[PDB]
Symmetry: C3
Subunit: 132 residues, 3 copies
Amino acid sequence: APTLGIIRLEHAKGLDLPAYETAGSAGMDLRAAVAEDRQIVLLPGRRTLVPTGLILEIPQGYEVQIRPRSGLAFKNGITCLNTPGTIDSDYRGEVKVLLINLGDDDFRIERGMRIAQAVFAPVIQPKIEERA
Amino acid sequence: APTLGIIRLEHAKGLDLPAYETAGSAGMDLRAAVAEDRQIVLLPGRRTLVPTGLILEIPQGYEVQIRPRSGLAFKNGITCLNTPGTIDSDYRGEVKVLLINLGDDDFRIERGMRIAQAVFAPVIQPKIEERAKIS
Amino acid sequence: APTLGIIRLEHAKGLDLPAYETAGSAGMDLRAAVAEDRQIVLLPGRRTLVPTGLILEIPQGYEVQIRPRSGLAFKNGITCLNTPGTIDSDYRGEVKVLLINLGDDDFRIERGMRIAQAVFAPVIQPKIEERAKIGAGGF
């Protein structure tokens, strides 16, 4: 099995590492690493980039997809706007989740809230051949 | 090849099992297993769960992704809000599809309508190693 | 490595083909093949199907996923409405990207603009077995 490296930045240190819940799980929940005293309200129609405080180190040949939580999508109409979000094996910046409120409630985002799921997947760079 | 188990519930009566159209197909189309003599109305901005009438039995090591139907996205602005929806090997509920109307017309959901596609894939759980420095 | 064939239609003449930025890139950017000195102005809440002028010949056992660019989603609220758009190995039509504007400002699509990314990956088909009796997936 490949190894996924995770660095917790300072604002993610008090939150758990991502992990698979069971041997059957497809993904790992990611949480909002906003400050405890800086909760936000995502208004209907609006979008916001939510920090996780994580840097991912994905080996060559793999990617991580950032997918929506189904519960939040159903209950509140919240989703990830750029889904599935593509984290490259090459990326060493912080992973951030772009949420959009496509419902009609004023949705509160708080530190520690589960906001998305990460799925680790193979990816290939094919030879690209122009043809007639 | 791995085997995907499918249970058809009673309200899926008369609807075929999902199947791949060809050896080249990446996904299987799912249909709306809603009551036969009713149209469900999905107004602009609204979302709703649509039953497929299927329980999937996905073997450990694999997942199913639920992806949008392109034709309904183009023609009516309809999509799957939580796309790509993740169904794991633990899940044994009925598969439901979360549609949202991001167009300007009343959209009518009818029995048998194709509403999404299912893509079956292996899933990998990498070893998670916390690191203090960029490698 | 497998080979992705790309046939260029007339309106993609003059444009760079899709290519990976680095050896670690998961996706390669797709460009709008609208006529030069033509524009698509996409108003808030509207969707439009943007031509790439490319046909992909993907070999069997693989698919291409059309996914959104993160920068357009963040900066403009633009996304791919049918994401991830599946292109299978049987598909020989022109690739067209279905953009929707979920932001507040107009979004102007111009020739050559990078409007999506394509991710190439293996795909499998399981055997399907009907059963009578008996996790992410529920709501």
